[PDB]
Symmetry: D2
Subunit: 151 residues, 4 copies
């Protein structure tokens, strides 16, 4: 069982059931946990970025999915939480490499920037692709953890 927490702001609300669906499409072991808004009225992305990022950091869930206008807001605010490696992806390549090289634990996408079928592909690829485990990446990821600790 690999839980994936889902967060959005208002531009991504209309596509939230899509994101739920795309998590389950990655495999039966992938369980979506919807932590986004309940209504379509404006909300502030940091509020929902924080909720999902804290769950990931605390290890309640293995993965996060965050959507907003461009995904930029989500990736900045999620990365403020220690333990989070939030990757803003715009295609299949960035989704795969975020996992292989960076061991990313949160994938961020933009609703106004990336079509839903590419959002589908991103989410599925992010979840299914393993971290390489290579020495250099393991070292670089540990160096990100050391930047957190120095602050």
């Amino acid at each position: 069982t690999r839980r994936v927490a889902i967060g959005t702001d208002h531009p991504a609300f209309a596509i939230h059931e899509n994101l739920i669906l795309y998590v389950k499409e990655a495999g039966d072991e992938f369980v979506p946990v919807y932590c986004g808004p309940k209504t379509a009225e404006s909300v502030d992305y940091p509020d929902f970025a924080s909720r999902v990022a804290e769950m990931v950091a605390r290890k309640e869930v293995e993965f996060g999915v965050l959507a907003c206008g461009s995904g930029i807001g989500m990736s900045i605010a999620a990365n403020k939480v220690p333990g989070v490696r939030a990757a803003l992806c715009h295609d299949h390549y960035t989704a795969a490499m975020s996992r292989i090289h960076n061991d990313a634990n949160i994938v961020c996408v933009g609703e106004r920037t990336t079509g839903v079928e590419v959002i589908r592909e991103i989410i599925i690829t992010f979840l299914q692709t393993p971290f390489s485990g290579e020495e250099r990446h393991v070292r670089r990821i540990e160096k990100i953890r050391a930047i957190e600790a120095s602050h």
Copy 2:
């Protein structure tokens, strides 16, 4: 009155480092590049250079940063670990503009392996030239990012 812009890369982006320097100048006379990346070909660790540039931005030694890696991802994660930093992974003109308009982003991140140099150029120029909107919901949202930083 002129605006400093620090540039960092790891090894795959080293091959285009004078490109990055050039594109910063291309945004206007008032933009001064500050090269902080691998002085040479050397395979290096992106978080070391993201930190160098991220710290300069957070200390207000430069106004903006430009970071390049393979996909841009490692640079955006590592730079966002520094409080005071809003580092945006951009891949086209629209994200470069909106990162500024909505998020008041102070670091632009790009991948050399994903995004062609003429779009990287367009990203950098758009980033540097586009102003923050100052609009109420955006200020409040940026403050909420700061409040998150304060809690950790």
Copy 3:
């Protein structure tokens, strides 16, 4: 007055009024002419690609806008009409350069690939950006016309 004919298939139907709106947003001189489907049921992209491309070729309208799943189908089928330079754009850069270098007369976009705000930006940039008029491009565009004539 610069008429712009608009064509879609079914995945782009839900966003057809968007495309109408984005044409007018480029300027008051830009007049949208909707030539896409009236209902959301499946249709074949070549049918609507051809209608718009023929209007452009015959010079009824100055410009075309075509949307489908990925935009690939639209750009292949529209380019089959002599006189058409249909450019599949996915960002601002490709929209600008399609006009500056290629003198493109039709812009093609994918609904499932490119978010509407980037589709907005593409359409506005395509319409507002002039052809450079440079010798080399004028020569290359004339060489495209010579490929048509040899078939």
Copy 4:
């Protein structure tokens, strides 16, 4: 039983021409690159090389073509002028896959100025390896493209 793949570029894509050759091989043993672009640095006219490769595909001398220019656009326009050709401008994995699945595309077009080499690699590989679906609505739509060609 092995599948030939002709490659053409103009001048900005010349710098990555052995990349393109390499990536075609990377899709499998059964893929044979056929280099047809500028043998040298020379500033050239994209329609001359789009034609060379487009004609080889239409004559069935090769099964696939790969075309690279600045933005990929001029290559897709010029190659689509040859009857029998379905040339797709792709910029990521999804368009590369769908061009094959839905449109049975026989030429892949890319921009060196817009799309980074590792994604160009991914585009080429995905294009070559992904099969046409053969599904009814797609066959009919492809035939309608042919019927358009016949009318001119």
